[PDB]
């Protein structure tokens, strides 16, 4: 099938991205559709000596789905280049499990980083969202729907820099401007757009919806969306037009922007350039 073809095609292939396994040394697990370990790499793409990196790999007992997502992630990361998108340095595929060598983000996930804090200003939180918005605009212009946008999938690198991560679920939408998934998806339901939940339709405008949930996650310093509401209740709660109330410590302008990200009709939502301009307008009231 599609995967057997992709495995054979891949194993018979770019010396641009291949990295000798023997120059790579793995350490502790950072997190667990894959696993990530901290690692160190010798003579990595013209960097002399060792460079600290993260390494994405398959878990124990990988299904075909998981293998496919690793291969797809690899494929998206090759095409992609933005200060707010995680950087790929190479891959080991030749005599051992498939390993993707990627940018180490010293603070871990944005969720984790938010949860560890209190000291952060609204200005810091706005800058974070703005950085993410710029990365999303560049992926959107590259014709890619990310699908899985969430605090847990955004890394915080050196300097408190946002890095969009986890491209397993990203799809190319050059031709049709939407990605349609027949069977049930694997994005948490509390981050999915209404048309994704009901019609299995994913577009840049469902990324915007997700971005709205992510704003909520930022403003709450890593809260759990729809707290105490079971995922199965979401269908009915969304079509009957309910949305999350304004959280504390959230300004009127911000909340207004989350709601617009959550408009029932996709075409009525802001595109990522409007989101960035909107976030600038708030940043201007603080800096």
Residues near a copy of itself (CB under 8 A): 1-4, 7-8, 11, 58, 60-68, 96-98, 181-192, 197-200, 224, 230-232, 235-236
70 contacts 55 by C-beta, under 8 angstroms: no
Q: Is residue 148 among the annotated active site residues?
A: yes
Which residue lies nearer to ligand X2M by CB, 104 or 130?
A: 104
138 contacts 168 by C-beta, under 8 angstroms: no
- Mark the segment that binds ligand X2M (CB under 6 A) among 30-38, 140-148, 186-194, 248-256: 30-38
Q: Which residue has the tokens 């019609």?
A: 199
Cβ at position 63, least distance to ligand X2M in Å: 19
Cβ at position 29, least distance to ligand X2M in Å: 9
Residue 95 is encoded by which pair of tokens? 């005599």
For residues 210 and 258, what is the distance between their CA atoms, to the nearest angstrom?
10
Provide the mask over 50-69, with x wherever binding to ligand X2M is found by CB under 6 A and - wherever it is not: ----x-x-------------
Element at 125 (helix H, strand E) = helix 122-141
Which residue lies nearer to ligand X2M by CB, 36 or 99?
A: 36
Q: What is the CA radius of gyration of the chain?
A: 19
Q: Which stretches of 161-271 are DSSP H helices? A: 194-199, 204-219, 234-239, 252-261
Largest CA distance in the chain: 59
- Mark the segment that binds ligand X2M (CB under 6 A) among 28-36, 134-142, 250-258, 269-277: 28-36
Of positions 102, 140, 149, 215, contacts ligand X2M by CB under 6 A: 102
Residue 77 is encoded by which pair of tokens? 């990361």
Catalytic residue among 8, 14, 124, 148: 148
Of positions 92, 105, 129, 221, contacts ligand X2M by CB under 6 A: 105
**Residue 170 binding ligand X2M, by CB under 6 A:** no
For residues 238 and 241, what is the distance between their CA atoms, to the nearest angstrom?
5
Binding positions for semaxanib are 103-105
**Catalytic residue numbers, as ranges:** 148
């Amino acid at each position: 099938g599609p995967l057997s073809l992709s495995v054979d095609a891949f194993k018979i292939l770019d010396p641009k991205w291949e990295f000798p396994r023997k120059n790579l040394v793995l350490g502790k697990t950072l997190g667990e559709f894959g696993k990530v370990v901290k690692a160190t790499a010798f003579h990595l793409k013209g960097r002399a000596g060792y460079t600290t990196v993260a390494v994405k790999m398959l878990k124990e007992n990988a299904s075909p789905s998981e293998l496919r997502d690793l291969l797809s992630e690899f494929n998206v990361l090759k095409q992609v280049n933005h200060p707010h998108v995680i950087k790929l340095y190479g891959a080991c595929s030749q005599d051992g499990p498939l390993l993707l060598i990627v940018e180490y983000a010293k603070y871990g996930s944005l969720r984790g980083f938010l949860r560890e804090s209190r000291a952060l200003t609204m200005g810091d939180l706005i800058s974070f969202a703005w950085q993410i918005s710029q990365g999303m605009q560049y992926l959107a212009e590259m014709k890619l729907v990310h699908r899985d946008l969430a605090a847990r999938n955004i890394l915080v690198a050196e300097g408190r820099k946002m890095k969009i991560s986890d491209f397993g679920l990203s799809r190319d939408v050059y031709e049709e401007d939407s990605y349609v998934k027949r069977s049930q998806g694997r994005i948490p339901v509390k981050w999915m757009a209404i048309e994704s939940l009901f019609d299995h339709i994913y577009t840049t405008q469902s990324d915007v919806w997700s971005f709205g949930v992510l704003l909520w996650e930022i403003v709450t310093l890593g809260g759990n969306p729809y707290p105490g509401i079971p995922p199965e209740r979401l269908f009915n709660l969304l079509k009957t037009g309910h949305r999350m109330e304004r959280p504390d410590n959230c300004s009127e302008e911000m909340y207004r922007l989350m709601l617009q990200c959550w408009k029932q009709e996709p075409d009525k939502r802001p595109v990522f350039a409007d989101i960035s301009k909107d976030l600038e307008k708030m940043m201007v009231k603080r800096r």
